[PDB]
Amino acid sequence: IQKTPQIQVYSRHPPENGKPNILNCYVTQFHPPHIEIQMLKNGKKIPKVEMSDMSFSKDWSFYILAHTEFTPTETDTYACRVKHDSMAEPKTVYWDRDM
Template identity: 45%
Template sequence: MKYFLCFAILFYLGSCALGKQFPPKVQVYSRNPGKLGEKNTLICHVSDFHPPDITITLLRNGVEIPDANQTDLAFETTPGNLTCKMEEVGVKKNPVVEVNLISSK
């Protein structure tokens, strides 16, 4: 009985540790230094999260950007609002980063 109780306690502590969630870090940055009138690439980078079950969505002016690759979300920019939205399973409040891209004209 003593061994069963020890096993049950160890199992409980192990499952609590595995179920711990770490908040993600979301960054939006440009590939090159910004120059007025020149094309650049914005990168949405999500890191430092656990568990690894997440969804990253890129939106331009509130509309999802079609065919965004989940492993490399770099793309050419045009003026408007860019939103990088990360959703993690089991988390109610997920980070959202929004950048306003200003027209050079």
């Protein structure tokens, strides 16, 4: 049976406008392990998105870390967009700098 992905979107370092950083999309707690993950900038696909190898937790659910280099500005919105069999439509969650 299918378990729905839990998604967090967050920077590696304290964000500062104009400063290179890494944006992470941490997708956890899903089953089955087949999953499509995309990172978006202002609605558009970020090209060189790196993906950790898949792994799982003590409770059998799968997790995976997508990440990409980025430079936050004040006006850019960044998002992670997950597609998975547990959900009938993709789920987008947006980067909030305070979280």
